[PDB]
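Ticket closed. Logging final result for lipase.
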Amino acid sequence: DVSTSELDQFEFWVQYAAASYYEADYTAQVGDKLSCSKGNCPEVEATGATVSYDFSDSTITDTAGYIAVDHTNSAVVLAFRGSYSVRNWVADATFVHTNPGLCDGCLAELGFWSSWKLVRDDIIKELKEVVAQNPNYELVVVGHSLGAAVATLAATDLRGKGYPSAKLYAYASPRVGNAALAKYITAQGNNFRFTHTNDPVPKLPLLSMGYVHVSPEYWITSPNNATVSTSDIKVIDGDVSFDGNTGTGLPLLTDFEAHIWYFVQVDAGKG
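Final structure:
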């Protein structure tokens, strides 16, 4: 578608892423290882790875994471985571752118870147160381989300630085840146891324614113828891618017858951 391986790786890575877231791982320580717891992662744981380182987141920142390583594979790783818261861121946141640197244109976213840167440196340183240680390883880166874105850126840165490769992964893532850155890264490669378915874261831121893323893517588818495968895844490549895631548519937351787942758951750781 793828392969397985790749797936495985992717698954593984894522786881780582888852782881891262946791815291534991881152924281842881170083080484340680890673782981986771718941488971897722496982694988890673296984491987083981550880850581190383880481870172955381716291216050310142957131872121966281870581690184680781692984070984097984190887690787290283880184992762891342871122923131958581896422848812717130897617728802518310713112873115721115820145640138870173890396490359251109590239630138881227710122926150893432820132975271890464711160851381880176440380890481880178650580890585380187670780790587260184380881070486081979690778690285890877891673993451997842935111972471993845951161892771991616870281890776790228790383690659550049050194690384490259690294890887890445892423896962888812857313875117870152632118394209360129894416491219660168892618290229680088590795890467992976893733895414788942738807997710837312891845877617863113856216493319438219510117831114873118890276590639490639992966895516896954498946658913948540578931597982895955391969087938478922796817791848794518690238971114665119339509395719894957872115395519578916825117873113838513318711758717856221797827997010976391891726594969596995892652876151758981815491878431």
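Residues 124 and 151 are 14 Å apart (CA to CA). No further action required.
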